[PDB]
Symmetry: D2
């Protein structure tokens, strides 16, 4: 009945991982943060934690992923390489909402070096709270994304 | 000659001629190859993403540009193609860093989120900015390829 | 009835009917009063900023909306009018916080920087979000009035 | 021959004031940061430091101002109430450049809670390095801003 939300970061975004845990809780009591990012401030490679969270989402161990890094760009590239993952790099409320409404995104990506924590807060909450629309055209398009995955499997 | 395949969906069709011009503005060496819809009628972004992304994957063009409503769908779909690194950019900084850190080969923009002058800036910056070639970045990009390999 | 004066310059003239509609979308109580140019020919933003800002200052309308290329000129000029608090917004968060913290009475947007769907979001959020009325915010807003007074 | 750049913040942006000093220097050796923000992390009111920096710019004690706060919105409202000041709230490279090119802005405002430090870095550098265009229409429009000031003096 509650909804698990896996969280990953690289090194620069480690400073805000408690923030991320908190922002997930702020979305609602039904959202459970599962912190899977570095345990310390040590330099890491983003694809390893993108992969870690992405696989959890793909295997359905969690419903949602949060990936925070310098820019979030590498996070969104790495995570989308995992089949079943729809990872959206968001920079504001609008992209966060539309990633859910149009793309039924299951991973939100943000940049610690690009986006202020209060906007990251807003992004995480909006992403978790905004439902997928279910509308015919979006379903068809998401299915075409799945078709692209299959053709390369 | 550095060829740049351009794809859009319906809302971004209205600015396709802008994208063609912005690519050229990046320098004489940059050659736009328009692969988007030829009318304003509604299409599905993954069809145009795939088309551009396959061209990049297969080395038929060096770069792609995908423009849609938000660009989010474009970046999800394009990245499903092995060898693609598609970066959804919303400013100069992300456009630059996508090349510097990630050696992105596709740039994604939202026509409904980002004004055309910033889209212009994004495209020019993306094409002009070189990959750093720095050690850690090369290692991380290979790690992306190792994720692809693990699912192929 | 909560009246909202709308002003633009030339690049934002193309979306003036959008702004009129976005104001209405904020709720039935919101009434757009268009005070921008009536043709696409080039104008000077401070003329339209002043016009809208004077209406807000004089209490003839509750709110203003200024749309230009970047909105930066709009926000500089509008703020030169005593009683105006003009907020240049580029997303939902700034639009909300301009009302919550600053009790902004004019919202400024760039047609060349910010896509129309985000402009739509900015306008709706700006108009719908109430000022917090919190103590520190009231004190700081009065401090803004004391800066005006010190130069009048 | 060098160019003084006054820096102010409120409380939340105090954490990054050394960043701001550094970013001004990064624009070039000709740019001299003059830190005028809070000396400590104590809660302050943004208009007081906006005023402080704005007056310095208006009196021409410095050429440029940097104001960093939560959102930067209040900073840009307060600073523009000082005659002679053209304070631009910027959130990216484009607005930073155009504030100089079109508006000959003399104060840049940023939000610590909205904009990541690396974008703030880019904003400050672009603002300081980008020249005013001098073009006829911008001069006329800036003069109309001055005219608005006069009519309320």
């Amino acid at each position: 009945m509650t909804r698990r939300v896996a969280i990953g970061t690289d090194h620069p975004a480690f400073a805000i991982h408690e923030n991320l845990i908190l922002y997930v809780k702020e979305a609602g009591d039904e959202f459970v943060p599962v912190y899977c990012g570095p345990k310390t401030a040590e330099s890491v490679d983003y694809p390893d934690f993108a992969s870690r969270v992405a696989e959890m989402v793909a295997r359905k161990e969690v419903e949602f992923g949060v990936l925070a890094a310098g820019s979030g760009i590498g996070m969104s590239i790495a995570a989308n390489k995992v089949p079943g993952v729809r990872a959206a790099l968001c920079h504001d409320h609008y992209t966060a909402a539309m990633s859910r409404i149009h793309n039924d995104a299951n991973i939100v990506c943000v940049g610690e070096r690009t986006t202020g924590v209060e906007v990251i807060r807003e992004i995480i909450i909006t992403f978790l709270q905004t439902p997928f629309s279910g509308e015919e055209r979006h379903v068809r398009r998401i299915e075409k994304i799945r078709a692209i995955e299959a053709s390369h499997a």
